[PDB]
Amino acid sequence: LPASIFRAYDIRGVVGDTLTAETAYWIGRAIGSESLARGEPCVAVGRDGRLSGPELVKQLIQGLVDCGCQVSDVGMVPTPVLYYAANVLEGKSGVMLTGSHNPPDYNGFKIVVAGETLANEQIQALRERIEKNDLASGVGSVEQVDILPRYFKQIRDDIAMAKPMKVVVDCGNGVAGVIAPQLIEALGCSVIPLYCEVDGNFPNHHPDPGKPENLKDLIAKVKAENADLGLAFDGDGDRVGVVTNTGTIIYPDRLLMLFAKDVVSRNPGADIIFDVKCTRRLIALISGYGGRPVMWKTGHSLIKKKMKETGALLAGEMSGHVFFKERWFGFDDGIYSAARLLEILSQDQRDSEHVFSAFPSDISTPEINITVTEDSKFAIIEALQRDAQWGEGNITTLDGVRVDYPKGWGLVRASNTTPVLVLRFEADTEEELERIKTVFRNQLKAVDSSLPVPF
Numbered sequence: 001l002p003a004s005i006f007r008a009y010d011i012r013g014v015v016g017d018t019l020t021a022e023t024a025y026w027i028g029r030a031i032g033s034e035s036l037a038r039g040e041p042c043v044a045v046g047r048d049g050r051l052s053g054p055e056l057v058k059q060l061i062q063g064l065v066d067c068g069c070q071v072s073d074v075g076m077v078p079t080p081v082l083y084y085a086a087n088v089l090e091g092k093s094g095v096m097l098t099g100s101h102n103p104p105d106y107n108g109f110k111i112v113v114a115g116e117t118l119a120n121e122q123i124q125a126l127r128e129r130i131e132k133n134d135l136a137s138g139v140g141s142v143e144q145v146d147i148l149p150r151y152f153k154q155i156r157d158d159i160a161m162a163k164p165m166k167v168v169v170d171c172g173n174g175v176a177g178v179i180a181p182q183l184i185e186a187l188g189c190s191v192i193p194l195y196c197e198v199d200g201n202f203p204n205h206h207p208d209p210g211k212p213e214n215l216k217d218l219i220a221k222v223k224a225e226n227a228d229l230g231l232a233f234d235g236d237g238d239r240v241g242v243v244t245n246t247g248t249i250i251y252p253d254r255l256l257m258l259f260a261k262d263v264v265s266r267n268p269g270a271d272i273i274f275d276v277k278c279t280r281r282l283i284a285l286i287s288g289y290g291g292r293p294v295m296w297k298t299g300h301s302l303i304k305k306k307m308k309e310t311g312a313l314l315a316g317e318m319s320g321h322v323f324f325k326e327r328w329f330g331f332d333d334g335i336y337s338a339a340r341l342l343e344i345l346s347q348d349q350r351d352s353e354h355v356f357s358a359f360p361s362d363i364s365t366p367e368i369n370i371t372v373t374e375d376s377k378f379a380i381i382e383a384l385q386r387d388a389q390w391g392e393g394n395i396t397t398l399d400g401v402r403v404d405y406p407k408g409w410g411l412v413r414a415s416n417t418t419p420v421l422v423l424r425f426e427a428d429t430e431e432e433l434e435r436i437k438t439v440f441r442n443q444l445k446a447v448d449s450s451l452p453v454p455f
């Protein structure tokens with residue numbers, strides 16, 4: 001099996017090339033062995049709407065079964081529904097077969113074992129099992145479980161929408177279409193569907209609400225239909241994008257301001273987690289309502305782990321993953337976050353544009369990417385951490401180098417998956433922005449004078 005598919009927070013590969021049926025079997029075998037090693041024979045299995053889902057999922061299950069695991073096969077479901085299954089069924093283990101928002105031929109695995117979402121060394125240990133044949137052998141079983149209706153009723157039952165809302169819902173032909181439009185309607189909305197047919201060819205836009213270009217159709221439809229809100233789901237439904245009645249894109253850090261106000265209102269002192277790419281206004285806002293803001297590393301597995309360690313009731317990150325523990329289970333779920341958002345907005349007489357525009361806003365630069373090399377990317381950050389001078393900065397080095405000034409901040413970090421440096425800058429003044437930008441440019445140039453700093 002190829003080492004490259006075993007990533008930091010999941011397994012991901014190309015089904016024609018790096019991810020075969022055979023590989024999927026041995027991955028099931030490694031996962032099952034590890035679940036049993038943690039005392040858990042019971043494993044949920046779900047898949048997204050990808051074309052390779054059927055061929056791959058059978059191998060995954062057989063691998064689990066050949067360990068002696070009791071598999072609950074919940075069929076084609078959003079990623080959060082699989083996480084849900086691994087919280088309400090007998091077992092605390094679950095595997096989601098998904099390629100998230102990637103092109104049609106990508107697929108992969110997101111893995112929970114006895115409550116814990118695997119990351120870093122834990123994933124590499126699965127591969128290690130296959131290389132060493134450190135694998136359990138047994139006569140397992142498969143049970144089919146229909147979990148969607150239960151998930152549906154769980155959310156519907158706990159959400160209390162006041163006013164009615166007209167909502168455009170864009171699933172990008174990903175697996176969220178099996179539930180998000182129907183659930184949102186049931187909450188008390190009129191749903192204008194966009195690309196809600198599940199189709200793993202992805203013949204319209206890619207199901208990635210993080211890129212503005214995949215929100216163009218949503219925005220136009222929200223305006224043309226005079227809708228109250230637009231929602232966009234990623235391919236597997238663990239991320240959601242949001243646009244106001246006027247077409248303004250609301251980024252997750254701003255979404256978290258609304259959610260944190262709400263969660264903290266009922267839970268004084270609640271820990272709230274966000275990543276190093278989030279606006280410094282979120283920190284102040286959380287603290288001002290009496291919450292405990294916790295800045296953490298980028299990721300999904302990392303934020304999820306940090307939530308468990310801190311007792312946090314809410315987390316989010318800039319890629320659109322939002323994690324509710326309050327009234328929920330603590331995993332990322334775009335569909336439930338959408339429900340929670342609709343609940344709050346339905347209780348405000350103002351339109352969604354005004355609800356969000358009321359919060360303070362800094363001047364933000366669009367995220368910046370600098371292509372370096374795979375050999376240098378971590379070394380550049382290490383060099384900044386060693387040599388860089390940032391003045392009275394409030395320096396954070398959890399994930400690259402973030403520096404918080406009184407009126408703004410800057411971040412530089414190495415992409416885990418690509419040979420790229422990622423930067424963000426935000427300030428209250430356009431003067432401040434160009435000053436923080438100036439400092440970072442200088443410090444990168446002091447590491448390598450030949451580095452292409454495009455700001």
Ligand SMILES: O=P([O-])(O)O[C@H]1O[C@H](COP(=O)(O)O)[C@@H](O)[C@H](O)[C@H]1O
Nearest residue numbers: 012100102298319414415416417418
């Ligand atoms: O890897 P990073 O640190 O650049 O991080 C970026 O890429 C990752 C992998 O993307 P993909 O699944 O499409 O390969 C994403 O999970 C993450 O949200 C994104 O910010």
Ligand SMILES: [Zn+2]
Nearest residue numbers: 100234236238
């Ligand atoms: Zn996703």
